[PDB]
Ligand binder design. Structure first.
Ligand code: HEM
Ligand SMILES: COc1cc(F)c(-n2cc([C@H](O)c3c(C4CC4)ncc4cncn34)nn2)cc1F
Length: 386
């Protein structure tokens, strides 16, 4: 019949409440994995004391066969991924391990192959599956939430991961409007389309207000001098120029990029929907965002290329000579420009200024240039405002 997004199929694994985030993540693994759980839950103490690497090297190789459902496999990825970052970087002062012991590398790679995700911590692990409600009968607010794992005391990982998650959830409230958009275009329902675009804009405007909470829960000194170390990967990294050896799984060292919000499917989703061709051309920013799709869960990666197969919303609006429809489309693009402009100020506070008192991103190239290119591509998609 063809690529028609008239409904969001349950096979895309997009939750009605939390969107691309993992709904009600599992907190405990079966008892068989207690040795992994003790290490993952005590990374601040084990790293600070210099005992982390020895505790990891003492592990027996545990089979992944006892992780029988999706949520336990996602929790185990988050546990193994946090342990791997702590093992590779240690205290973060130049003494790096270039070989991941087989006792963790083998189950980590087996589980990563099973979930079609690389054997490195991704945004879907440390943001989308790394959370819980303190009280299940209370709403999804910062006060009623916590992360499952942190790297070091005072690293601000709770604030950084949770505010990223909250923004991600706020933007997700617009996903349910996508089938209304495609259906209104197919059925030539102008008023329905206009109303749907304004609702998407409203959601993206609310996501910016949610972002303001970053200042209360993250401090620049801790983010840049402490958390930054554990967010780093091994692709174009001079500290691990050939990548990491996953002992017992692969013969040669392998390179994988560190976790990135370029792996967020909700932001890539609205750029695709609005025809902001962030992945077009052969430039660095476009190549990076396309590359980050292979670091997203497979159903979410599938949702994005499915959106790309649908008719263009931008081309539909551009061809109508309808001021009301063009304004509603621009309200969506404007809300993304506003988010990106505010995020540039956040990056200046949390990265640029601390770095100046001491910038390359996950892609190995200047992060300010990447962000400004992404923002500029969005601003240039406005049909009028200039
Ligand atoms: C302490 C605050 C923050 C800092 C320092 C920060 C830093 C960065 C950096 C360095 C990048 C470039 C990509 C990379 O190198 O991995 C990036 C991209 C991005 N960030 Fe953040 N970020 C912050 C907060 C947030 C929050 C709360 C969100 C909400 C989900 C967010 C969403 C994004 C998105 C979607 C991108 C991809 C580029 C774009 O779509 O404009 N960031 N961020
Ligand atoms: C030179 O100094 C630095 C360079 C940097 F690249 C970073 N860095 C990288 C990320 C990453 O993209 C990220 C993540 C990941 C954990 C998955 N999660 C949420 C998020 C929101 N926006 C970005 N997010 N955030 N900061 C930090 C640095 F200090």
């Amino acid at each position: 019949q063809g690529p028609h997004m008239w409904t969001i199929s349950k096979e895309y694994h997009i939750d009605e409440e939390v969107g691309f985030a993992l709904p009600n993540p599992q907190e405990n693994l079966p008892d068989f994995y207690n040795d992994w759980m003790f290490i993952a839950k005590h990374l601040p103490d084990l790293i600070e004391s210099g005992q982390l690497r020895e505790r990891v090297e003492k592990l027996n190789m545990l089979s992944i066969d006892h992780l029988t459902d999706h949520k336990s496999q996602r929790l185990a990825r988050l546990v193994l991924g946090c342990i791997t970052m702590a093992y590779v970087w240690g205290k973060g002062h130049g003494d790096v391990r270039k070989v991941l012991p087989r006792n963790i590398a083998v189950p980590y790679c087996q589980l990563s192959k099973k979930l079609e995700l690389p054997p490195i911590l991704v945004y879907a692990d440390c943001v989308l599956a790394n959370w819980k409600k303190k009280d299940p009968n209370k709403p999804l607010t910062y006060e009623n939430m916590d992360v499952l794992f942190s790297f070091r005391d005072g690293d601000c990982s709770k604030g950084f991961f949770l505010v990223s998650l909250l923004v991600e959830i706020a933007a997700a409230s617009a996903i349910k409007v996508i089938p209304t958009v495609f259906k209104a275009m197919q059925m030539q329902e102008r008023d329905t389309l206009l109303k749907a675009l304004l609702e998407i804009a409203s959601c993206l405007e609310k996501a910016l207000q949610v972002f303001h909470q970053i200042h209360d829960h993250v401090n620049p000194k801790a983010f840049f001098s402490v958390l930054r170390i554990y967010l780093s990967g091994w692709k174009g990294n001079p500290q691990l120029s050939d990548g990491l050896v996953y002992e017992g799984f692969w013969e040669d060292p392998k390179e994988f990029a560190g976790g990135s919000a370029g792996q967020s499917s909700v932001f890539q989703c609205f750029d695709v929907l609005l025809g902001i061709q962030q992945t077009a051309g052969g430039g660095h920013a476009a190549q990076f965002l396309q590359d980050m799709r292979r670091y997203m869960p497979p159903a979410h990666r599938n949702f994005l290329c499915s959106l790309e197969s649908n008719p263009s919303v931008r081309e539909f609006v551009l061809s109508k000579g309808d001021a009301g429809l063009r304004e509603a489309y621009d309200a969506c693009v404007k809300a993304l420009v506003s988010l990106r402009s505010y995020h540039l100020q956040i990056v200046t506070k949390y990265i640029l200024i601390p770095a100046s008192q001491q910038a390359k991103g996950t892609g190995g190239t200047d992060l300010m240039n990447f962000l400004k290119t992404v923002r500029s591509t969005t601003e240039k998609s406005l049909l009028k405002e200039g």
